[PDB]
Design a protein around this ligand. Sequence first.
Ligand SMILES: *[C@H](O)[C@H](C[C@@H]1CCNC1=O)NC(=O)[C@H](CC(C)C)NC(=O)OCC(C)(C)[S@](=O)c1ccccc1
Ligand SMILES: *[C@H](O)[C@H](C[C@@H]1CCNC1=O)NC(=O)[C@H](CC(C)C)NC(=O)OCC(C)(C)[S@](=O)c1ccccc1
Lengths: 306, 306
Amino acid sequence: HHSGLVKMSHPSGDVEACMVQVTCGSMTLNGLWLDNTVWCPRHVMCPADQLSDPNYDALLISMTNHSFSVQKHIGAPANLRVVGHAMQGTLLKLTVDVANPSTPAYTFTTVKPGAAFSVLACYNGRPTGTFTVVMRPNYTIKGSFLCGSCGSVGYTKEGSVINFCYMHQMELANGTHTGSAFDGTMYGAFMDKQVHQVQLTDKYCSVNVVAWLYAAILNGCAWFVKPNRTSVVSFNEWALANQFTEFVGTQSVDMLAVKTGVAIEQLLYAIQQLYTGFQGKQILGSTMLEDEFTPEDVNMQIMGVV
Amino acid sequence: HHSGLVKMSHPSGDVEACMVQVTCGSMTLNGLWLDNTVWCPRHVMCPADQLSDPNYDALLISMTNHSFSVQKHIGAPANLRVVGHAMQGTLLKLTVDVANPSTPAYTFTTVKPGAAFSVLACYNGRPTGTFTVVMRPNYTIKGSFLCGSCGSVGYTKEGSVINFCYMHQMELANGTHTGSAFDGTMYGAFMDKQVHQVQLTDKYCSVNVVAWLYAAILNGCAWFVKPNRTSVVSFNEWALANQFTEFVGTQSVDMLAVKTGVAIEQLLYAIQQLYTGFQGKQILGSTMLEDEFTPEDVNMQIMGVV
Ligand SMILES: *[C@H](O)[C@H](C[C@@H]1CCNC1=O)NC(=O)[C@H](CC(C)C)NC(=O)OCC(C)(C)[S@](=O)c1ccccc1
Ligand SMILES: *[C@H](O)[C@H](C[C@@H]1CCNC1=O)NC(=O)[C@H](CC(C)C)NC(=O)OCC(C)(C)[S@](=O)c1ccccc1
C-alpha cells in the first residue's frame, strides 16, 4: 500500500527565468537575476589555487564592473552589462543595467531545520534538475550537486510569491551540502573557504516524524498507536538525550490530530517506542523513522489542504 | 555519508506553459496543449453518475465542439475555442483555433517498467508540484495525486526535446496510480472506468537495484561485494522465483561497472544474498534493497554523465 507521499517540489518555471551564468575571469558559476540585481557566490572572485585562504575584501577591491560577465542562456538570451558590484556576507550583489522582465513576486527568507524547500540545480546558467530537501538540524541538506552547481537556488512559495532561501556554496566531507541565505550568511557555522570544516551532529526532526506517523494513520496504518501518551515537555527532555529535535507543535500538526482523532502525545509515545526498534514490523514500507516529510507535506499531499 | 542521490525531476517550465483546464459539462480536469491540439482524458465527457460503465463512443457522438471549454490560466491567460474533437484510445484530441506559442520540441513515447520520468501535478489547469517516479513492473506509479489531478502529465527529456509519456487517469485501491500513453493506450491492463480492477503483483526492478549497489560502491560502501558471481542467465531464473524483474544490462549499467571495477555478475550475486537479509547492516542508510534509482540517475547525479 503506497502512502501517497512523494518528494514534491514546486514548479520551477518562474525561477528558471531568473537563472544566469556569472563569469569572473577564469571562474564561472550560476547567479540569480531579480530586478536590477544578480546574486551569486562571492568565491567566483577567487583564483583556484587560493580558495583555501582568500581575502574577499581585497578581491572585491581588485574588481571593476567589467570584471563580471553575466549571461542569460535560456529563453531569450541576453548579455547583461554590470554597472555596480558589492558584497553582502558570502554573496556578491551585481547591479545590472536591465531589470529582469521575468522577475516574479519574491521575498528573501531563511529556512529553519526540518522545513522543506525546492532546489533548482543549475550548471553554466542552465537549469538541469529540481528536487526538494529538508534543512537538517546541523544546517546541511542532503542534496545532489556537482562541480559547477554553485549559485543554484532554493526556495519556497507562498501563493504566487517565491521566497528565496538558499544559494548553493559547498559540499562537506560526508556528502551533504550547504550554502547561503540571501542576507549573505552561511547556514550553520560554515565558512565559504576551501578547508575541511567541523560539521555538527545531525538529529531526527521530531515534528516531521510525527507528520509521517500521521500520514501512516491516514493510510489506515495505525498498529503503533496505543492509548499511552508522552507529554511534549517530557518528550522534549527525552529528545535531548536521544538525538531528536525538540517538538514544537503547529497548526499544521493540529489539523492532522483533528483529522485522525489521534493526539500528538500518543505519537510522541510511539516515537519513543519505535526508536528502540520496529520489532519486525513496517510503517509505510519502512523499518526506520522517516523525518523527510513535513506536516505541511502531509496536509497538502493527502488531504489537499494548503 | 549521504550518497548524493535525490529524486531529481526535470525543470518543469517548458511543460508548465502547455497545461490548460478542460471542462465538459460539470466535469473538469487538465489537458496538454501542443500546436493546435489539446490532449485530455476522455472521461471528462462522462457524467459522474455514469463513470462505472461509460459508453465512450456514444458520449463522443453526443458532443459538439461547444461541449468543451479550454482555458490557459498561467502566464498569459486565454480561452481556447475548440474547432474539432476526436477520441484516441482513452484520450480526447481537441483541436483548438490557437496554436500554443510555447510549444516545445516534443515527441510521444512509452515508458517501460523501471524507467524514471518527471510528473507535473496540476489542478484546474494550474501546476502545483513536480516529482519523479519509476514505472513499476505492474504498470502503476507510486505518485501523489488527488481529485482533479487527471490530465497531469509525465515526460522525459533528451536534450531540448520533451518526450511525453504519461497522462494521469486513476488511483488504485493500494494507493498507486496509472494513466495513458499519448497513443491513448492505458499502461498495463487497466481500463478507464470507475470499477474496481485487478491490479497485478509488483516486483523489484533488478536493473535499478544494481544501479543502487553501484551508487553504494561509488560512495565507498562495498562490504557486500565478494569475488562470487552469478551469471545473468542464472540470476534471471532466480528472479522469476523471487519477485524480481529479469535483468537486462545496458550501456548505462556498463559504465557503472567500468567506473567501480565491480562486475555486474558480482552484484547479481550480492542481490541474491542481500535479499535473504542485510544481517543487521545497512547500505546507504537502508536496511532494504532500493529500486527507485536508475542506472542513468547514478551516472548523472554522482558522475555527472548525461
Ligand atoms: C561550487 O560549484 C562548488 C560546489 C561543490 C563542488 C562539488 N559539489 C558541490 O556541491 N563549491 C565548492 O567546490 C566549494 C568552494 C568553496 C570556496 C566554498 N568547496 C567545497 O565544497 O569543498 C569541499 C570542502 C569545503 C573542502 S569539505 O570540507 C571536503 C573536505 C574533504 C573532502 C571533501 C570535501
Ligand atoms: C481524475 O482526476 C481522477 C484522479 C484520481 C482521484 C483520486 N486520485 C486520483 O489519482 N481519476 C478518477 O477519479 C478515476 C476516473 C475513472 C473514470 C478512470 N477513478 C478512480 O481513480 O477510481 C479508482 C477506482 C477505479 C475505483 S480503483 O479500483 C479503487 C478502488 C477502491 C478504492 C480506491 C480506488
